[model samples]
Target: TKTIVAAKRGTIYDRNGNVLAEDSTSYSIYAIVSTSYVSPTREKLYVQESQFDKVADILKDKLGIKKSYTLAQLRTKGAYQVSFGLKGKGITYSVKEDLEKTFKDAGIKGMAFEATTSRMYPNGTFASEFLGRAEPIENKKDGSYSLIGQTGLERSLNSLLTGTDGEAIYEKDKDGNTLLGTETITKEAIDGKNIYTTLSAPLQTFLETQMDTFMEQTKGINASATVVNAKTGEILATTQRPTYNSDTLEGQAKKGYDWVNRLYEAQYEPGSTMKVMLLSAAINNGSFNPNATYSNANGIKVGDVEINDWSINEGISKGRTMSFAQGFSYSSNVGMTMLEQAMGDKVWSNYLSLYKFGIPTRFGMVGESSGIVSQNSVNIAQSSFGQGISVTQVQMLRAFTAISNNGIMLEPQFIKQVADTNKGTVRTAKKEVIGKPVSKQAASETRNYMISVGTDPEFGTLYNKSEGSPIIQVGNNDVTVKSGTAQVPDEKTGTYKVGTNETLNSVVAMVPSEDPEYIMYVTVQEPKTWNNNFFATVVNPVLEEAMSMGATLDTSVSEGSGKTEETSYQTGDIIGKTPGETANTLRQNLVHPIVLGVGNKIEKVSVDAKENIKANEQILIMTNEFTELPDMYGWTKKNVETFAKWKGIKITYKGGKSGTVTKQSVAAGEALSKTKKITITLGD
Candidate 1:
């Protein structure tokens, strides 16, 4: 036979027509030697199978093909026709062209590159897992490979997105050549549809940028995040840190391959985040009231368990009765316990069902799990707060859907539309409403209470300011956040490790007071901390820092809100030798240099100038920014703002904290002018 059959197909693309995964056209080749084609003059020791033998030897070395296998392929039943394995391997673009030239010059009749397509991903790692890997298909079912959706959106909507492939049938003349102008049947292919997600690509990109910073800060390799429109359930952004690069698997074995949507699959106890939904159930079932009050005297007993408030000291704990707003601000487990007890068995059980606490949402995303849910004194006692249950991040966010946006829990979706590429059309997504967990009044009350918790004089200070102050403006946006540090019982120890002054932490926050636009949750497991505090304290700063960069808030804009307490940081004494040396020592402690404009007092200066600052050495202190630029330049942008907030001070920054400092305006240890304006430029 002089001819053979082959296959060809196009690739898939995103909404913007960017190839999510696709292929390019190419050929297959082989070398051959024939006595008929060789010149008679060169008949002396003419190469018989040597052409193929040599070709196989070279291809085997360069392309990792088996030598004996290549020879067997070249001598197949259709010996005159070369066989290119399905989805043609070992013949990329450059190799295919080289084969065509070499075979033509040698007059080898059998060598050729069959026209075909090669699968590729131009976006690198973007949507890599969702789109899946592709393989070449030489034979329909066996010889070659075809692109198939192995997971994620691609797999779920395969039927709608993958079009039916058409075929061509024709007859040939006796010579086996196609008869010119002969009648033939032609069937055109139905190209796969294009898919558009409601997710904002820009938002996804932004989230990815922040996620990178978070992974660096927490030293956690398994951090993931997601964002959804509160009212619509349209998932705007879904990102995971430490993701594997499929194209290049250099560190893949170390990381290990995992599920793409593990955010929806992985379920764990939501800690304090579950309180919002738990309270909602009580209110929705008509067993709990928004204005109801509770006092954190000692600890509220639920069954045999003693539930304590997050910040209840003897002062706040003794004889301090407060409204539901105060209860939420303090995140009092005792309060929730009392409320759960009041709601009782039937009502509490019904409310938990209403809130869909234990139910796995049918969000259409694969690998979703229905978290553990039970009804009883123990279950209600523990579940009333955030423990005794496991819920995915997706499920917890769903609870807020009712409180933030009109009390409707819509199914979260990633893919918005699947396009019919052949026809240039699309299949839009359908919304599934999971009934409201609470009434509008109850939801509003909950948000209002949450806001108060964020801004309260005593409770709110824990998150807004650092160093335990009650109020402070760290950024432009007025934020109301509730931070939580929970101790999950370690199975090995069989008891929860109570967080002393230090421990691991988890925090969930809903930001923006007027309307409540975004809800964010952060979790850190066994954090390796540099500074002192255990979980919440160390992780809170990281969370605040993330929000500062992510929300694009102006950290420099201080509220200048009325100061209730003293605002003064006693400049620690620098007791070195020369003024420069002393300044250098202080500089080591401080972020950047201090400027003494006009009559600004340097306050305290001690350093020996005779102690030559060796080249780039810090006689007094190294200017926050050195030589090219320093990452330390963002000292003002450091975690200090969280502390300033605790003390109720308005922070203003001159330089952005995106990068490190390269230059500064002020020199250390001189009278600092009251109106002194220091300048700094950052470097990469």
Candidate 2:
């Protein structure tokens, strides 16, 4: 008499096989009021005249319906049947059963139920825009309903992600009752192929948390950030504000096209952040000498227009002279303009092409921008310090990888692998080299100069008030970073805003100074207020959190060596050493020591002195009996392993995924190894 149709759509997963999006079973309520057949009472099943009001009342009472609206719909005379608008659709299984029972108990008939499917995002409100949304298909001649991708990856990979519809039919008598043992199937349903992305779900969550905090504190009009593996080019995390919930499509219409990935789509002038590129080009062309002094002033004239330094815009920094390195570290616009003039237009234009600016990276995402670079003299000078040109965060990150990666630039990537139904990865992303923009010497020197922006107290833009100061410390590893605060052009005037508050603030930072692992780019647009220390206060914590997360992967397990892949070194004699000194010594060798004391000098260590240890290996130092297992939440496996190795605790781990520790077998402050086994489960 009828057919059953359903097929599971393929799932979308993170790199660690954690589900991001998948098909979910649901139900809808309808009615068969036009049926000609009689009910079990042998009476015509059509609704009686008086039952219309009764039905309306019942719907109002049981379904929370609008009384007048329900009666208007139930009062339709000529229509064969009807259902409430949205209220009548997408009922849960429990609601479906309960409503059917209520109607049956009231001696009501003609109600029909149809099983349906909808998209479900287990990680609610996460990467929603990037993964996209799905909607249910309308009526079909084959008598089946399915979900279709509407946007984002869902829309792009629709054919590959959608499943084939299947049908089953049975012979029935005139009364519309199915005949026994007469079912037949015409075709089998095939589930869609699963897609695996290079995203780290945990890192995405971390970035989202940070973005949420930034949105709340900065009251920013827009914000976004991205983290990419310097060597592999895989985008570990990308997030932004004004994102909608994929599950409910909440605020979808209001957000509209604003939902496009900002990291790939939106373009903005980077301000002084672009100085690193100008510095690199200067060094590469043999025009830049780090020690050479440049006459510094409040403003420099390129053509008829005069460009002012940030300090000069605030009416400061006039008539001074400093080395090119100091000029760069201070983000001196005058210094950069002088360097730009020395470099000339032809070389700068060539470097623009070489840096892949104004040319879309084809970052595999729709609507990615290549950015715009002007060639005029004034525009060239402005572009020297990141103005008069627009760029997407992806392009900026790609360009900076040249410095951290030793001159070899890589195209940013997101897709990690594509998977088939057999659980095999059909394709995987490879390290793609875009070009060699600078020499290793040039890149290294540029990186060192950038580091001086934090380490060199006298000239470093990120330095604190103290002498020889560095702001934004993460362990003992030196942080090489640059901050940008560029005025946004007013829509009405088409001129740059005057105050710092109406500006775009951004930062690009890399950890470990020597061999970088990750590069992060963070930006906040049109914030309520701006502070010079915002980089150290807000952005630095995010970088530190990312570094902390990265510290957890167990890389120490090696062939015939107790050392893990994370690091290889022997524990030094840290007893009686200052905490800062001890951390510095361990960090230089790639070891992460978990200090557990307040005093300046170390006293006891969980790991014996001179023992071979791995990177992220925990060495619990007690300046004064501060011992016991610390909170292990958010720690990576490598960190946990290191802790266990140092404290001599046995750990049993669950959920083999590349994520932070969500559950720890041993409670914090409890006796160490008291249970003898610490079970940990990691997830995004």
Candidate 3:
């Protein structure tokens, strides 16, 4: 007697050991008919034909097979018994057990079941494009089957994921009965290797939640985002709208292109986000100084083509002359173009190449674009501020690594390591640094300029607005941010369509800007609301939430306890208490209070009365009265403006260029009045 044993496929796990893909037990049923049964035997004649109807009916009813098709096949008298086919092959263990009992009671002899394993995605749509799908394949030699990867990482790393099959043999007597204690294994089956990726299940979930909300509210055409480790380039979370569940390839197939991961595939003009690279290049070339002044003529003409400053075209900051730093802080196209021409096209184009623009990222993803970088002076000028050039989110992310990682550009990687489960050997992915696009000093300076996009006393108002402050507070640190908006090009004429047309909004942010940690780059294409700060509107909240959640996870437990802070402190129910009473009580226990409303009684609190709260954490208490706007000191101009808009208050500005509101015309605690103007002045 001989038998072949199937090897279990490897499992795919996220950074935190969350299972993404694994194998589930399954069974396949086939029929075997002896030729002697078909011939006229002494005791039996055409046994298969006699029992065909009963067998067909049972399988059709139990396994959902088409009765008509089963009956037609059963009517045919073949020398060999037929299988129900793929449709009937994958039956559950319960179904197989039921069939076995029914057939055995009926004294049927032809039905046989082969125990098998099938691929199962436990997370369903989680990392669908990254995990791909697997399908069963049969061996030509023994007709045994095993699942094989068909796409995505499953296919890319198939060799590592496919296990070796084992066989066993036993001595048998003339009757084909195995001899007692004669069973021996000829070879051992080895399970496939396990893949441990850098993907964060929690972050992935958080990002997906944000994507769902954005998709639901905006109903925008499409969107893609990726978060990477600033120093190592480990992809923490990557997802897109119009994605599909890996388990159900049917939806993906019908939707078409949803399976194509947009992080690396979707390319678009990066708009002002591209300014970071150009700024870095100019700084490295020693041809641009942040303190040096530039004339904001509202518009500049280059070779008969005119480029206008964003503020000038929008009827603000007209004919204003500001320092190079202010121009960059305001994302001045004229300022960037002027510097680009002064630096010369050769220097600018060389930096583009050095930044890996117009070059494939080569990170091993499928259908990735290299993006286009122009060499001509006119096009280079357009590319200087992110107009003429095209880039994918991942490509832009890769380039920005230099800014965050001290000038060394690290290749973005999804996979972290592959482990051979049987041998306990693990192979880790190599971190490749393609090039150093700028000096460390230059990179540092570039970061400072980026900081000014959010923190500058002036010209940073657009990104600093209250509702959309890209500043993410993690622990005690504040993340710096920059945003961009590019006019979508007309598909037919390639000319930019502005005003009511779609615009690409993006944000690049880094935590603890002075000494960065993780960097996130997110892009939303053709969002319903097209504003330079649109990316901040969506990206900031997601980043802040993810960071806050991540911090709780990272710091929940003390070392050696190896436990979480979920049970740290329990508080009495204070739902009906006054806001002042609740605040006083929580403050005595070192819990910071976040007053949500202005009513007398506490309507709600973020923490459950029965649950524990972390020490010094901000506990939100809601009330019925309206929440007053906090003091506007050090608040971004954009954030202050947002508060004014939401409160129905008129704003009168007395400031230079743009900056945080140093003094509010109206004092804090004053009732929000639409009739009065809250005048603010911008100063250092």
Candidate 2 lDDT tens digits, 559-594: 213321222357667778876456544533334455
lDDT of 3 at 73: 59
Model 1, 1-684: lDDT tens per residue? 112222233344432334555556555543332233334575422225757676576556555677777777766652333443542354677876665565556654445443455555565655444444545434433222345545655554444445665444433333443321112336555665555555444445565566666656666525556655555555655655456554553334655344535456666666665677766666665776657776776777767767777656424444467776567777777877777777786666665655666665545444457778766568667877777766776777677676766565554555544444444433344444444556676776566666665567664423344555323222455543454544556667766655432233454554453455555555544444422222233233433454455423211101221222211112344332233333323222211232211121233222232332211111112232222211122233332233233224344454557643334454322222231344545444
Model 3 scores worst on lDDT over the 10 consecutive residues at: 556-565
User: Where does candidate 3 stray beyond 4 Å?
Assistant: 1-8, 33-79, 82-89, 94-108, 115-118, 136-148, 164-191, 250-260, 456-458, 461-476, 499-501, 531-538, 545-684
> Over 4 Å off in model 2, which ranges?
1-7, 30-112, 137-146, 164-185, 249-260, 422-425, 466-468, 551-684
lDDT score at residue 626, model 3, on the 0-100 scale: 60
* Residue ranges of candidate 1 with Cα displaced over 4 Å: 1-28, 31-109, 114-121, 125-141, 165-189, 249-251, 255-261, 282-293, 311-323, 467-482, 489-511, 530-684
- Global local distance difference test of model 1: 0.50
What TM-score goes with each of the models? Answer: 0.61, 0.68, 0.68
- Name the Cα RMSD for model 1: 24.3
